[PDB]
Amino acid sequence: YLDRKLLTLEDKELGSGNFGTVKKGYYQMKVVKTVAVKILDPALKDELLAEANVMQQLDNPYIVRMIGICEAESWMLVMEMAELGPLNKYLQQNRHVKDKNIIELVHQVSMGMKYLEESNFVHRDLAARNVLLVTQHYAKISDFGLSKALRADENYYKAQGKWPVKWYAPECINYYKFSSKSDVWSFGVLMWEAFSYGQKPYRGMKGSEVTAMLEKGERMGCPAGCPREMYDLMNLCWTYDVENRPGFAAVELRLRNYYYD
């Protein structure tokens, strides 16, 4: 547990939500570290605790690191600061970013997901809004509130909450089954979002209308300026049958090779 005397919080919020607010802060460790703090009904407790318990077990450069928990006037989840914030919003305001720079960022997301897959964790909310930027050339995965550590004997989680259908693979909607392969579908949508400079996927459509579109074999089109090799990867991520769909090892490899070629 973190010491409240060591934590200094800035006045205004970086953002907010149902849970509460996200404030900037500084945690004294001789070297003072800049931090992001999630500040908050036992439902919110269990969700912040479960997110904390997932982040504790993770150690990778492309996944936001947890510093610790601080009980004070409220419950606080103190993390590394991704100063530039949500990838979608960043791109919504910076169209100068080249396609080579976007490939670097999505590849970095695929490396973080390669590690999550090997660690047998499922994210279940992979979207451009949850990829936070440290610098313009350094992204990290965030928001582990819906994430699940898979049991040693199974390859998926069977869900019984939040329901972002537009990032969800068919097996999730039909059978409520979430695996690393489901995250790969979400990653595909995430790439589309990145190459469309933060625009929303399937705009104007209801969840049921997205499901019908996909069940007809229809997919989203190629965003303006998006390379062909990257668009062919999106479609590979959106393989309907979970068996034929690639894992993050094959997805990460595909992004690595094209980036350096």
Ligand SMILES: Cc1ccc(-c2ncccc2OCc2ccccn2)cc1
């Ligand atoms: C829900 C939410 C997420 C991110 C922000 C945010 N916005 C603008 C600049 C920075 C931001 O947050 C950086 C951050 C947060 C959590 C862990 C690491 N880094 C605000 C609200």
